[PDB]
Scaffold this active site. Structure first.
Site, short mmCIF file in Angstrom:
data_model
loop_
_atom_site.label_atom_id
_atom_site.label_comp_id
_atom_site.label_asym_id
_atom_site.label_seq_id
_atom_site.Cartn_x
_atom_site.Cartn_y
_atom_site.Cartn_z
N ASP A 49 23.49 -7.07 44.34
CA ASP A 49 22.50 -7.53 45.28
C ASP A 49 22.73 -9.02 45.52
N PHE A 50 22.00 -9.57 46.47
CA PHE A 50 22.25 -10.93 46.95
C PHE A 50 21.24 -11.93 46.40
N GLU A 108 18.70 -6.57 50.55
CA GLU A 108 19.05 -6.64 49.13
C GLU A 108 18.89 -8.06 48.60
N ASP A 109 17.64 -8.53 48.63
CA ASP A 109 17.25 -9.76 47.95
C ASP A 109 17.92 -10.98 48.58
N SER A 110 17.76 -11.10 49.90
CA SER A 110 18.31 -12.21 50.65
C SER A 110 17.27 -12.63 51.67
#
Ligand SMILES: [Mg+2]
Ligand SMILES: [Zn+2]
Ligand SMILES: [Zn+2]
Ligand SMILES: [Zn+2]
Ligand SMILES: [Zn+2]
Lengths: 67, 206, 51, 46, 1131, 404, 115
Positions: free
Chosen positions: F40-41, E759-761
C-alpha cells in the site's frame, strides 16, 4: 510562524487581517463575529484566521544576532 | 536579520497581489522579451528597506514594497483594509531586498492566480439529476433556487441540458473582477486562435 | 546466499491508475543514475552515437 | 581577508585571524558567528 | 457548597489545570534528580566505610559532607565561569557541576598523639545536571530571563547535556523489592516458589533474592526448601530456622503457623520437619549450610562462620543486617513460608508478575545513584592504593593527588553519553537503552520521550504477557501510546496525571506506629499473631495491631492533613489477609484522585472558587492536596479503592451499583498520555488507530521548540505555517500543542477522484502547496574540528589549494573563505564543500580532509558558528537550510492513524469544487475508513466544519456526553450546510456535478518527517566494502540494495538462473582465482610475467582460472584459516 | 526491471515490469499489482533491479513479467484482481440503472485501449439514446469468454424459484461471448478468486489480453467514477431512530439475560454441561448471550442501511470492509477478549477499580455496548485498547516464528 | 530533485509540435489529434463543440497521464465530412461564441456600472 498571506484553499488574502482580527477580539467580539467583520465568509479563510498561532511574537523575544 | 529565513520572505513576497489592470496586457513574458534577465518591458522592480531601530515591533508590511512603476503597486497599498504583513522585526533587525515582478498565470504558480474564489453553479434545483440526493429534503436550497419551501428539488427534466451557469468571481486584488472575466475570455479565445493556426499549418503540411 | 548488488534503486511507491499492470513509473533521476550496457552494432550505431 | 565575526553574547563585530583562539575582544565570549556573505543569492518567490 | 453537574466539566478541568500549573509534564524527572542530589549522593558518601590504612601511623579518611556548586566551566586559563546550557549545546560541553566533599584525616600513631586535619571542599568529581532542576542555572528563571539566555520558556527540561548532546534517562521497570511474591512455574522441579528480592533501605549492594519453594509432588509428601544467596544447593527451611537459633519444632511452627487450630497447614509443613530431624542444634545447622555452600570449608569452624555471615548479611537484608536480628529474620522467613503454604493450600492467589503494584520505575535519581555508588566505590579503592603505596614508605601523602576525579566525572559522562548503564569496562554486562538522545523533532516527541518508561524484558522475548496492556496500567500508563514494531507493550508512556513517587524515609511512620498501639515483632508472643493484623513498612514486618480499621482511618487522616505521612506514601489494607502494607520507597507510580465522603465529593464549590483565582490568592494544587480533597493513590492501593468514574456515579440510582465509593476520577481522559491526548474523539476510533497516531504524532512536523534559531541540531524540521487544530481536546492546553502545534487544518474531501489516492494515499492541492501549505524548512548541522593532537600531524581550517593538497576532490572550493569556512547565505549543492580542512602530512606536506555536504541535499547555508571545544581547538558548526515543499511521495497523516503518501497534486482548477468555490486541500480515499473504523476522523471533520463556520474551537475531549454527532449535525445545519457534512462537488475537469455528494471539511493533518527525497536512492557501480568487495550499505554510503536470501528463493522459484547469477555473482562481487588442478587450493598467479605455480604441489603447468564471487574466495580463505581444506576440484 | 517488495514471501513479490519514465521521485505502480506485493502507499518503498544483459533481460521478459504472473500456482487462481476504487465503481457501474449518455460513452471509450472504434448500438434508443454500464463493460471484456458468477448480495433462494434467469436484483452474473449479459460485477467476478472473469480471461485469452483487460477496466471505471464519485462520511455511519431503539432494546435484553445467568450461578441453580467446569459453562452461556446480542444488533444495523450507504457500497463490492465493521460502526463494538477470554481480573477480583468485586456482568468484563459513532465509555475504551493490544502483539510476534 | 518546472505544462519544447494529426486506421474517417501543452480546458470545449456537429460520429478526448502535458482528441465524422474540417469548424465556432460572450459581457458591465 506568521499569518499566511493567502488562504491555502481559495487564495483570498488573509495577511492583512491578523492584526485587525486581534484588535476586534480585544474589542470584545466573539471569534465568529470578528471573522464576519473582516469578510471571511468561506470556512477556509475562517480556518486560516481562527487556527493561526502567532509564533513570531515568541521568536521576537530573543535578541537578534547583531545589535 | 529577521526571524524568517530568506525563502520564507521570498515566498511571502511572491504571494502579495500587485495591481495588474492595464499593465499586464502591455508587459511581455520574460521568455518573449529580447532583453537580458530583466527590463521595464517584461518586469517591474520593487525595493524594500526596513530597519527596526525603535523599541516597539516594526511591522514590515506590503506598504514598504516600493515600486519603480506607479501603476503596479501592492493592492493594499493602493488608495479600510490594512496592509499585508511581510514580517515583524525586533529592535536591531533589518530587512533589505530587491524584487522583480513578472507576468504569469495560475498554471505556473498560484501566486499568479487572480481569484480569491470562483463560485460556479448550475441547475440549482436538481432538475437534470446530475446529483442524486439520498434524502433530498435534508439539503439546503441554493441561493439561486426558485422552489417553494415544501419542494426539495425540481421535477426531473429528461430533455434538459445544463444551461444558465451562475458565477461569482472574487478578485484577490490584482485585477478587477470584470477584468478577470474579460481577460479570461480573451485568453481562451487566443488559446483557440493559436490552436487553429497550428492546426492549419499541420493540415496544409500534409 | 544474499548480498548487496549494483544497478539497484529504492524509493517510495505511489499509485498510478494510468500505468498498465506490467509498467512501473520510474523517476528520471533513478533512470539517469542506472545504466544498461548495450552492445554496438550497425543496427544501433547511429542511436548509440547519439546517446 | 579580515573574516570579521560577531559575538554570540555581545553582538560585536570583531576581526580574528587564523591561528587565533576564538575570543571576543569586548566580553571574552567563546562562541562567534560568521556574517552573511556578500554574494548574490537569488530566490524565485515560489 | 456542592459542585452541581452543570458546573462539573468546568470544575474538574479547573482542577486539572491547577495540577499542571503546579507540576508540569516532566515533574518525575526533576523530582528524581532533585532527590538524588539532595539526599542520595550524601547518603552514598556517608554509607561508604572509612578507609583505615596503616603500615605505626594510621589514617581513616572519613567523608562527612558534600557540596554541589552551580554548573561552571573552566577555560584553559582556568577561570571558573557560570556555563549556560545553550553554551554547552553549542560548544559540545557537558552541563555538569563540580561536587566537592569534605574530608577528615586524623593522624593516630601512639601516645595519644592525635590531631585532625580537615580538607574542606575537596573536589571529588563533576556531576551532570538535569535541566530545570533545582541545581540548574535555569531554575526559577522567568520566561523573559530564559529568552534572554536563548532558552525556550516552553522547554520542559528534564534532560542532561553531555558533550552538547541532549540525553534523556528512560525510567526502567523492575520488580519491587522487599515484597514476597509466590509464583508457580509449570516446568520446574518446584510446585510453588515464593521469592523476595531484598534490599536494605539505603542501597549499598544489589538485590539479594531469596526463594522459598515447595518441591513438586513426585519423597512421601511435599518438602519446603530455601535457595539462599551465595549457596548453590537448596536448604530445608527447618535447617535455616535452626541456624538462626530456633531449634525446637514448636518455636519454628510458632513462627510459621500462627493459627494452631489449622491442621492443613500443619500436615503441609510436616514433611519439612520430618526431613530435618538429624540436625537439631544451631551449630550443626550452620555447618550444614556451610557444607551445602559452594565454598565448603574442610574445617567446620569456618563453615559455621561463613554460614553465620551469610544468614546475617545476605539473607533478607531489608529485615536488618545487624546482629541480634535473628528474631525478625525468623519471623519474616516464617511469613514467606506461610505465604507459600497459603498459595499451596489455595487460600491465597498466586501473585501476578504483571501487576504494576508489584513494579517500580527506576527513574533518573535512583539510576544515577546506582552509578554513583559504583563510581564512588572505585574512587575510594583508587585512593586506598595511592595512599597505601605512600604510607608503606612511612611518610605523609596528599589526598588531593590521591583523588583522581576522572572516575566519577568520566563515569557519569560516559554512561549518560552512550546509554550503556554500568562501568565502561563491563561494556557487555552493562544494559543499554538507558539515557537516549532526546527526540527534538516535535514538541510532542520531546514531551513523550521525557515521559517514557521501559520494560527491560528483552525484545527477543516472544511471550506476550509482559507486552499485554494490563488492567493495572489504568491511569498510570497511556493505553494507546506504544511502539508498533518489535517493542510492543515494553516501551510505555506515563498518563498525564501519573506521578512516580520520589521516595521517603519510613522513620516518622514507624515512630508514630510505636507511639500508637502497634506492638513490635520482638516483644510479642506468636500466639497473638493469629487474630492480629500484620503491619509491613517498605516490606519489613515491623509489628502487629488489633484494630486495623481505625488504624487505617488514623493513617489516612494523617496523610490527608500533610502530617508526618507525606502524600506519596501508599497505605494498603488487605482485609481478607490481615496485612497492612505501607510503602514510602521510590518508583511507585500513582495518580491523583478526588476523595469521596459518604456519597459526596470533598471537592466543594469553594475549592473551585479559590482555584479560579489561582493567579491572585496563590491557592494552588498543593493547597488542594493539603485540604484533604485530593489524594495520590498508587497501583497497589487502587486494589482497595472503589472509584467513581464521574460524580454522576455518586448519585442515588433506581438500583445502586456501589453506594460506597471512596474516590473519584478527576477526568477519565487523563488515562491517556501526551501523544494520545492530541487525538480528537479517540473513543470513536479503533484502538490500533489511536496507537498508530500516538506513534505518528512524534514524526509530525511543527515547531519543535521556540528557540530553534540558535540550536545547531543535526536534523531539524520546522513547518512554515503551523496551525492549532480547529477541533481540539482539553488536554492539549497542558501539552502546549496550541503554542507549538504540529500540523495544519486542511479542507479534506473523502472522495474517489482520479484514482490517485487509492490504498492509503492522498491527492493534494498544488495551488495550496504553492501558497505555503505544509511547506517546511529542513536544517542540517555539520560539525568539524581541527585537531592538533601532536606535532606528527595537525589539522587546520584553511581554503585548500590544488598545488599543496593531495586528497583534493575535483569539486570546486571557491565558496570557502580564507578561514576555510563557507559563509552564510551561500547556496550549496550536493557534494559541495562547506569546511576546508587540511591535515599536515608526515600534494605535499598537507592532505585535504574537507567536509562535504551530505550528497543530494541542495540547501543554503543558514549560519556558521565557530568556538572552542572542551580541550580548546577551533570547532565549527555549519547549519544548512533546505526548503521542503510537499510533493508526490511525502507522507502525511491525520490524528487517527490515517497515513498516506501524496499520490498526485492537482491545481485549483483541476480539483473538485463546491458551489462556493472551495476546493479540498487534500483528497483521501473513502476505502481508508471502513476497515479501519476511524470514525473519529469523520466526527473531527464535521466538528471542524462547525468550528470554522461558527468561529470557535471544537471540543473533542474523549468522554464527553455533551458532544455527540447529532448535536454537531444540528449545529452544522444552522450554517447552511448538509447536517452530515456532505456537499455537492463539481468535477474540476468538466465542471459537471459529481453524482455522489462528497464528505468534505476541515481536518487537522500532519506532515511527517518521512519525505521521499530523503529516501530515494539508486546505484550503478559505486563504492564497495573493503573486506568483501560488495556494494556498500546505505544511501549515505552510496551503497547497493541487499538481494537477500528471500530474493534468492523467489528467483529460484521463478527459475531465473541467469538473473540469479547476475544478482548474486556479477552485480555484487565478480572475482577470479587460480586453482591447482591437483590439490584444488588457490595457486599463485603472476599475469604480468605469466608464471602460475602451486607451492603445495610444486607444479606450474596444471593451473586453472576460476570465476567465483569474492565472498566465496573470502569464505574459503577463512576456512583455510580454520585448518579446513576446501579444494575446488575442476574435474 | 525486476520490481520487489520486502518481505519477499512468494514468487509474485518480485515481478518484471517495463519502465515508464515520469516526472517526480517515486515508484509509480498500477493498483492491481499492489495485492501481489502486499503493497500500500502509506510510505512503502520498493526495490528496482535492472538486469544488465540481454540474456537476463530475456529471462525476465519470458518468465517474470507481471502478465505471466497473473495466476499463481499456489492456489490456481489469480493473484491480482480489481481493487478498491475500481471495484466499488465497477459494482456501481454494472448496476441495472446505470445509463450513460452519448458524450459520457465517448469519454469512456477514449480510455479503452482494445477498442475497435465502433460505437455499440445503445441499449435504449428512444426517447433518448442511452448506453448501459454493462454495455460498456462488454466492450472492456476481452475475446469471447463465457462466465457465470453471483453477486455477493445474491439471495440463496432465488436459484430455486422463478426468475432464475431473469434476476430481480441483477445478481447472477452472466457473461456470454464476451458481453456482460447480466449481473453486478464485484469481488466475486473481478477479484482474485477461482473462476472469476480475470481468471477465465487468463485461461482462455492469453496473458497479454488479460493485461489489457486489467488496464482497461481500471482506466474506464476510474474515468466513469469521475462522474459518479464515491465517498464516505458521518451520514453513512448514522442509523434511523427505529434502528437505534431496536439495537438498544436488544442490548438491554441481552444484559438482563446475562444478569439472569449470573443470578442462576449465584444461587447454585446452574449445573455444568458435559466436558466443562461450572466456571467454563457460565462463561459459555454469557458469551453465547453476548455474541447473540452482537449478531442481532449487527443484523439490525445491516438491514437499516439504504442503497446509497457508502459502507454498504464498499462492503457489497468487496473493495473494503465487512459487515462486522458496519455493525461496530453503527450498532455495537461488542466483546473485547484477551487471550480468547473476557477481560481478566487484573485487579483483585476486578477488571478495574470502578467495578465491585466479583462482577461477571457484561460491562464489567469488557462488553462494549456502544458503537464507534456513539463513542466508547472510559472503561470500554480501556478494554478495547487491551483487545487491540492483543492484535498488535500477535502481529509483531508471529512474524519471527513464521519467517523462521 | 525530480520536480519538473511549472512552465513545462504550458510551454512547448523546442522541436515539439503543438498539434499532430494521425489517421485512425480502425474505422474510416477518423483522426487522432495529439495536442501538446494543453489540458482539459481546451479538450473539453473542443470535444463538446464537436459533439454539436451532426456530421461528427465520435468526439472524445483524454489526458493520457496527468503528469504528462498533452491531450489526445479522437474525432470521427461521416464519410462526406472530414475530422480535420470538423476540428477546424469546432474551433471557429468556439472562437465566435467566445467573441460574442466577451462583447455581451462588456455590454453587461457597462450597463451595470452605468445603471
Ligand atoms: Mg505499507
Ligand atoms: Zn479561503
Ligand atoms: Zn525583458
Ligand atoms: Zn563578545
Ligand atoms: Zn597444488
Amino acid at each position: 510562524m506568521i499569518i499566511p498571506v493567502r488562504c491555502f484553499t481559495c487564495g483570498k488574502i488573509v495577511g492583512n487581517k491578523w492584526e485587525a482580527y486581534l484588535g476586534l477580539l480585544q474589542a470584545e467580539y466573539t471569534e465568529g463575529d470578528a471573522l464576519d467583520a473582516l469578510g471571511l465568509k468561506r470556512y477556509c479563510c475562517r480556518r486560516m484566521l481562527l487556527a493561526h498561532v502567532d509564533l513570531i511574537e515568541k521568536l521576537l523575544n530573543y535578541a537578534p544576532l547583531e545589535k | 536579520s529577521s526571524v524568517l529565513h530568506d525563502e520564507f520572505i521570498a515566498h511571502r513576497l511572491g504571494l502579495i497581489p500587485l495591481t495588474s489592470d492595464d499593465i499586464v496586457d502591455k508587459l511581455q513574458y520574460s521568455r518573449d522579451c529580447t532583453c537580458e534577465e530583466f527590463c521595464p518591458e517584461c518586469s517591474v522592480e520593487f525595493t524594500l528597506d526596513v530597519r527596526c531601530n525603535e523599541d516597539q515591533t516594526r511591522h514590515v508590511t506590503s506598504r514598504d514594497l516600493i515600486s519603480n512603476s506607479p501603476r503596479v503597486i501592492p493592492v493594499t497599498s493602493r488608495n479600510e483594509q490594512d496592509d499585508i504583513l511581510i514580517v515583524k522585526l525586533r529592535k536591531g533587525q533589518e530587512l533589505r531586498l530587491r524584487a522583480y515582478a513578472k507576468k504569469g498565470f495560475g498554471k505556473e504558480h498560484a501566486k499568479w492566480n487572480p481569484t480569491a474564489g470562483v463560485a460556479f453553479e448550475y441547475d440549482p434545483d436538481n432538475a437534470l439529476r446530475h446529483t442524486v440526493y439520498p434524502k433530498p429534503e435534508e439539503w439546503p436550497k441554493s441561493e439561486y433556487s426558485e422552489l417553494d419551501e415544501d419542494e426539495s428539488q425540481a421535477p426531473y427534466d429528461p430533455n434538459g441540458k445544463p444551461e444558465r451557469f451562475y458565477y461569482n468571481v472574487e478578485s484577490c486584488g490584482s485585477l478587477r473582477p470584470e477584468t478577470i472575466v474579460l481577460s479570461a475570455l480573451s485568453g481562451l479565445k487566443k488559446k483557440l486562435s493559436d490552436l487553429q493556426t497550428q492546426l492549419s499549418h499541420e493540415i496544409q503540411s500534409d | 546466499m544474499g548480498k548487496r548488488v549494483d544497478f539497484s534503486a529504492r524509493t517510495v511507491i505511489t499509485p498510478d491508475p494510468n500505468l498498465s499492470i506490467d509498467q512501473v513509473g520510474v523517476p528520471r533521476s533513478i533512470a539517469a543514475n542506472m545504466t544498461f550496457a548495450e552492445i554496438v552494432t550497425p543496427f544501433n550505431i547511429d542511436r548509440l552515437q547519439e546517446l | 581577508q579580515p573574516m570579521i565575526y560577531i559575538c554570540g553574547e555581545c553582538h560585536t563585530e570583531n576581526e580574528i585571524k587564523s591561528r587565533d583562539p576564538i575570543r571576543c575582544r569586548e566580553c571574552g565570549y567563546r562562541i562567534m558567528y560568521k556574517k552573511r556573505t556578500k554574494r548574490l543569492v537569488v530566490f524565485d518567490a515560489r | 457548597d456542592e459542585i452541581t453537574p452543570d458546573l462539573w466539566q468546568e470544575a474538574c478541568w479547573i482542577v486539572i489545570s491547577s495540577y499542571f500549573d503546579e507540576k508540569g509534564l516532566v515533574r518525575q524527572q526533576l523530582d528524581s534528580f532533585d532527590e538524588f542530589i539532595q539526599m542520595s549522593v550524601q547518603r552514598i558518601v556517608e554509607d561508604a566505610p572509612p578507609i583505615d590504612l596503616q603500615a605505626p601511623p594510621r589514617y581513616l579518611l572519613k567523608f562527612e559532607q558534600i557540596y554541589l556548586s552551580k554548573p561552571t566551566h573552566w577555560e584553559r586559563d582556568g577561570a571558573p565561569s557560570p556555563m549556560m546550557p545553550n553554551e554547552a549545546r553549542l560548544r559540545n560541553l557537558t552541563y555538569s557541576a563540580p561536587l566537592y566533599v569534605d574530608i577528615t584525616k586524623t593522624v593516630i600513631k601512639e601516645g595519644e598523639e592525635q590531631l585532625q586535619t580537615q580538607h574542606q571542599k575537596t573536589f571529588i568529581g563533576k556531576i551532570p545536571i538535569m535541566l530545570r532542576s533545582t541545581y540548574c542555572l535555569l531554575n526559577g528563571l522567568t520566561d523573559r530571563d530564559l529568552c534572554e539566555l536563548n532558552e525556550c520558556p516552553l522547554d520542559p527540561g528534564g534532560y542532561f547535556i553531555i558533550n552538547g548532546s541532549e540525553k534523556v534517562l528512560i525510567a526502567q521497570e523492575k520488580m519491587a523489592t522487599n515484597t514476597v511474591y509466590v509464583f508457580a512455574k509449570k516446568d520446574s522441579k518446584y510446585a510453588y516458589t515464593g521469592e523476595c528480592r531484598s534490599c536494605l533501605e539505603n542501597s549499598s549492594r544489589p538485590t539479594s533474592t531469596i526463594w522459598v519453594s515447595m518441591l513438586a509432588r513426585g519423597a512421601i509428601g511435599q518438602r519446603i526448601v530455601a535457595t539462599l544467596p551465595y549457596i548453590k544447593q537448596e536448604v530445608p527451611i527447618i535447617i535455616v530456622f535452626r541456624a538462626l537459633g530456633f531449634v525446637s519444632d514448636r518455636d519454628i511452627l510458632e513462627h510459621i503457623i500462627y493459627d494452631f487450630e489449622d491442621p492443613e497447614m500443619m500436615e503441609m509443613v510436616k514433611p519439612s520437619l520430618d526431613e530435618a530431624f538429624v540436625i537439631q542444634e544451631q551449630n550443626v545447622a550452620l555447618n550444614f549450610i556451610g557444607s551445602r555452600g559452594a565454598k565448603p570449608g574442610v574445617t567446620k569452624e569456618k563453615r559455621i562462620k561463613y554460614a553465620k555471615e551469610v544468614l546475617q548479611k545476605e539473607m533478607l537484608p531489608h529485615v536488618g543486617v545487624s546482629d541480634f536480628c535473628e528474631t525478625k529474620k525468623a519471623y519474616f522467613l516464617g511469613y514467606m513460608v506461610h505465604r507459600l503454604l497459603l498459595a499451596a493450600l489455595g487460600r491465597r492467589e498466586l501473585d501476578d508478575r504483571d501487576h504494576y503494584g508489584n513494579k517500580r520505575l527506576d527513574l533518573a535519581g535512583p539510576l544515577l545513584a546506582f552509578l554513583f555508588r559504583g563510581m564512588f566505590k572505585n574512587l575510594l579503592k583508587e585512593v586506598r592504593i595511592y595512599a597505601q603505596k605512600f604510607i608503606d614508605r612511612g611518610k605523609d601523602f596528599n589526598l588531593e593527588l590521591a583523588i583522581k576525579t576522572r572516575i566519577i566525572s568520566d563515569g557519569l559522562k560516559y554512561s549518560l553519553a552512550t546509554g550503556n548503564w554500568g562501568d565502561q569496562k563491563k561494556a557487555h554486562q552493562a544494559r543499554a537503552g538507558v539515557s537516549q538522545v532526546l527526540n527534538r523533532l516535535t514538541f510532542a516527541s520531546t514531551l513523550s520521550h521525557l515521559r517514557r518508561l521501559n520494560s527491560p524484558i528483552g525484545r527477543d522475548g516472544k511471550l506476550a504477557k509482559p507486552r499485554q496492556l494490563h488492567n493495572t496500567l489504568w491511569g498510570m500508563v497511556c493505553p494507546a501510546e506504544t511502539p508498533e514494531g518489535h517493542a510492543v507493550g515494553l516501551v510505555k508512556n506515563l498518563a498525564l496525571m501519573a506521578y512516580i513517587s520520589v521516595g521517603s524515609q519510613p522513620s516518622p511512620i514507624l515512630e508514630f506506629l510505636e507511639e500508637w498501639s502497634m506492638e513490635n515483632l520482638e516483644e510479642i508472643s506468636p500466639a497473638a499473631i493469629a487474630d492480629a493484623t500484620k503491619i509491613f513498612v517498605n516490606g519489613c514486618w515491623v509489628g502487629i495491631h488489633k484494630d486495623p480499621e481505625q488504624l487505617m482511618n488514623t493513617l489516612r487522616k494523617l496523610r490527608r492533613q500533610m502530617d508526618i505521612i507525606v502524600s506519596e506514601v501508599s497505605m494498603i489494607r488487605d482485609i481478607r489477609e490481615r496485612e497492612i502494607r505501607i510503602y514510602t520507597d521510590a518508583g511507585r507510580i500513582c495518580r491523583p484522585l478526588l476523595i469521596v465522603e459518604k456519597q459526596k465529593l470533598l471537592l466543594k464549590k469553594r475549592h473551585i472558587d479559590q482555584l479560579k483565582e489561582r493567579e491572585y490568592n496563590n491557592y494552588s494544587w498543593q493547597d488542594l492536596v493539603a485540604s484533604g480533597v485530593v489524594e495520590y493513590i498508587d497501583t497497589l492501593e487502587e486494589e482497595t479503592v472503589m472509584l467513581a468514574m464521574t460524580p454522576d456515579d455518586l448519585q442515588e440510582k433506581e438500583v445502586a451499583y456501589c453506594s460506597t465509593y471512596t474516590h473519584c476520577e478527576i477526568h477519565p481522559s487523563m488515562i491517556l498520555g501526551v501523544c494520545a491526548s492530541i487525538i480528537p474523539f479517540p473513543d470513536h476510533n479503533q484502538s490500533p488507530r489511536n496507537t498508530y497516531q500516538s506513534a505518528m504524532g512524534k514524526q509530525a512536523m511543527g515547531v519543535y521548540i521556540t528557540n530553534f534559531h540558535v540550536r545547531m541540531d543535526t536534523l531539524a524540521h520546522v513547518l512554515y505555517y503551523p496551525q492549532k487544530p480547529l477541533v481540539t481536546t482539553r488536554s492539549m492546553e497542558y501539552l502546549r500543542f496550541r503554542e507549538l502545534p504540529a500540523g495544519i487544518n486542511s479542507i479534506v474531501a473523502i472522495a474517489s477522484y482520479t484514482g490517485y489516492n487509492q490504498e492509503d494515499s492522498v491527492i493534494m492541492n498544488r495551488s495550496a502547496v504553492d501558497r505555503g501549505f505544509f511547506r517546511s524548512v529542513f536544517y542540517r548541522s555539520y560539525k568539524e574540528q581541527e585537531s592538533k593532537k601532536g606535532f606528527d600531524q595537525e589539522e587546520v581550517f584553511e581554503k585548500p589549494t590544488r598545488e599543496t593538497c593531495q586528497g583534493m576532490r575535483h569539486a570546486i572550493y571557491d565558496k570557502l573563505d580564507d578561514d576555510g569556512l563557507i559563509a552564510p547565505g551561500v547556496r550549496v549543492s550536493g557534494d559541495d564543500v562547506i569546511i576546508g580542512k587540511t591535515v599536515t602530512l608526515p600534494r605535499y606536506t598537507k592532505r585535504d580532509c574537507s567536509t562535504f555536504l551530505r550528497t543530494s541535499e541542495t540547501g543554503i547555508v543558514d549560519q556558521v558558528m565557530v568556538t572552542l571545544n572542551q580541550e580548546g581547538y577551533k570547532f565549527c558548526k555549519i547549519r544548512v537550510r533546505s526548503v521542503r515543499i510537499p510533493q508526490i511521495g511525502d507522507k502525511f497523516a491525520s490524528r487517527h492513524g490515517q497515513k498516506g503518501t501524496c499520490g498526485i497534486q492537482y491545481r485549483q482548477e483541476d480539483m473538485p469544487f463546491t458551489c462556493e468555490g472551495i476546493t479540498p486541500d487534500i483528497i483521501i480515499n473513502p476505502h481508508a475508513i471502513p476497515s479501519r473504523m476511524t470514525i473519529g476522523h469523520l466526527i473531527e471533520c464535521l466538528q471542524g466544519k462547525v468550528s470554522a463556520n461558527k468561529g470557535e474551537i471544537g471540543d473533542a475531549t474523549p468522554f464527553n456526553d455533551a458532544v455527540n454527532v447529532q448535536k454537531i449535525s444540528n449545529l452544522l445545519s444552522d450554517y447552511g450546510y448538509h447536517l452530515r457534512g456532505n456537499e455537492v462537488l463539481y468535477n474540476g475537469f468538466t465542471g459537471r456535478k459529481i453524482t455522489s455528494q462528497i464528505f468534505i471539511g476541515p481536518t487537522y493533518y500532519q506532515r511527517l518527517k518521512h519525505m521521499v527525497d530523503d529516501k530515494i536512492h539508486s546505484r550503478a557501480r559505486g563504492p564497495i566494502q573493503i573486506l568483501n568487495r560488495q556494494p556498500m550499505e546505505g544511501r549515505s554510503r552510496d551503497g547497493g540494495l541487499r538481494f537477500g536470501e528471500m530474493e534468492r528463493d523467489c528467483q529460484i522459484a521463478h527459475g531465473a538462473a541467469q538473473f540469479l547469477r547476475e544478482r548474486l555473482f556479477e552485480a555484487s562481487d565478480p572475482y577470479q582465482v587460480h586453482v591447482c588442478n591437483l590439490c584444488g587450493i588457490m595457486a599463485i598467479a603472476n599475469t604480468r610475467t605469466h608464471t602460475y605455480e602451486c607451492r603445495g604441489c610444486r607444479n606450474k603447468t596444471q593451473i586453472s582460472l576460476v570465476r567465483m564471487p569474492y565472498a566465496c574466495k573470502l569464505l574459503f580463505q577463512e576456512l583455510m584459516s580454520m585448518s579446513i581444506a576446501p579444494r575446488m576440484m575442476s574435474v | 526491471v525486476i520490481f520487489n517488495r520486502q518481505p519477499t514471501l512468494h514468487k509474485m513479490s518480485m515481478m518484471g515490469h517495463r519502465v515508464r519514465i515520469l516526472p517526480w521521485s517515486t515508484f509509480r505502480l498500477n493498483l492491481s499489482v499492489t495485492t501481489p506485493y502486499n503493497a500500500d502507499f502509506d510510505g512503502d518503498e520498493m526495490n528496482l533491479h535492472l538486469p544488465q544483459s540481454l540474456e537476463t533481460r530475456a529471462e525476465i521478459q519470458e518468465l517474470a513479467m507481471v502478465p505471466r504472473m497473473i495466476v499463481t500456482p499456489q492456489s490456481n487462481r489469480p493473484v491480482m484482481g480489481i481493487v478498491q476504487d475500481t471495484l466499488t465503481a465497477v459494482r456501481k457501474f454494472t448496476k441495472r440503472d446505470v445509463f450513460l449518455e452519448r458524450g459520457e460513452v465517448m469519454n469512456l471509450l477514449m480510455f479503452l485501449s482494445t477498442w475497435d472504434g465502433k460505437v455499440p448500438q445503445p441499449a435504449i434508443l428512444k426517447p433518448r439514446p442511452l448506453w448501459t454500464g454493462k454495455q460498456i463493460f462488454s466492450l472492456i471484456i476481452p475475446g469471447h469468454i463465457n462466465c457465470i458468477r453471483t453477486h455477493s448480495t445474491h439471495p440463496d433462494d432465488e436459484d430455486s424459484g422463478p426468475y432464475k434467469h431473469i434476476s430481480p436484483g441483477d445478481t447472477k452474473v452472466v457473461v456470454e461471448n464476451g458481453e456482460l449479459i447480466m449481473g453486478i460485477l464485484c469481488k466475486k467476478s473481478l477479484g482474485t478468486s477461482a473462476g472469476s472473469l480475470v481468471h477465465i480471461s487468463y485461461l482462455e485469452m492469453g496473458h497479454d489480453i488479460t493485461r489489457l483487460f486489467y488496464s482497461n477496466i481500471q482506466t474506464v471505471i476510474n474515468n466513469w467514477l469521475l462522474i459518479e464519485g464515491h465517498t464516505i462520511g458521518i451520514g453513512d455511519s448514522i442509523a434511523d431512530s427505529k434502528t437505534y431503539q431496536d439495537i438498544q432494546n436488544t442490548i438491554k435484553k441481552a444484559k438482563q439475560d446475562v444478569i439472569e445467568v449470573i443470578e442462576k450461578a449465584h444461587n447454585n441453580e446452574l449445573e455444568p454441561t458435559p466436558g466443562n467446569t461450572l466456571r467454563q459453562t457460565f462463561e459459555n452461556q454469557v458469551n453465547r448471550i453476548l455474541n447473540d446480542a452482537r449478531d442481532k444488533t449487527g443484523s439490525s444495523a445491516q438491514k437499516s442501511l439504504s442503497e446509497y450507504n457508502n459502507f454498504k457500497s464498499m462492503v457489497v463490492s468487496g473493495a473494503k470492509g465487512s459487515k462486522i465493521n458496519i455493525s461496530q460502526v453503527i450498532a455495537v463494538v461488542g466483546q473485547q477478549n484477551v487471550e480468547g477470554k473476557r477481560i481478566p481480573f487484573g485487579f483483585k477480583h476486578r477488571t478495574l477499580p470502578h467495578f465491585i468485586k466479583d462482577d461477571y456482568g457484561p460491562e464489567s468484563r469488557g462488553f462494549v455496548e456502544n458503537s464507534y459513532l456513539a463513542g466508547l465509555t472510559p472503561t470500554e475504551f480501556f478494554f478495547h485498547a487491551m483487545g487491540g493490544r492483543e492484535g498488535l502483539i500477535d502481529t509483531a510476534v508471529k512474524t519471527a516464528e513464521t519467517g523462521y | 530533485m525530480n520536480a519538473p518546472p511549472a512552465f513545462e505544462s504550458f510551454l512547448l519544447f523546442e522541436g515539439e509540435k503543438k498539434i499532430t494529426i494521425n489517421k485512425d486506421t480502425k474505422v474510416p474517417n477518423a483522426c487522432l489529434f495529439t495536442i501538446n501543452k494543453e489540458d482539459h480546458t481546451l479538450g473539453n470545449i473542443i470535444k463538446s463543440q464537436l459533439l454539436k456537429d451532426p456530421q461528427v460520429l465520435f468526439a472524445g478526448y483524454k489526458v493520457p497521464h496527468p503528469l504528462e502535458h498533452k491531450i489526445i482528441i479522437r474525432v470521427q465524422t461521416t464519410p462526406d465530412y472530414s475530422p480535420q474540417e470538423a476540428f477546424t469548424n469546432a474551433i471557429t465556432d468556439l472562437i465566435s461564441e467566445l467573441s460574442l460572450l466577451e462583447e455581451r459581457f462588456r455590454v453587461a458591465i457597462k450597463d451595470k456600472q452605468e445603471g
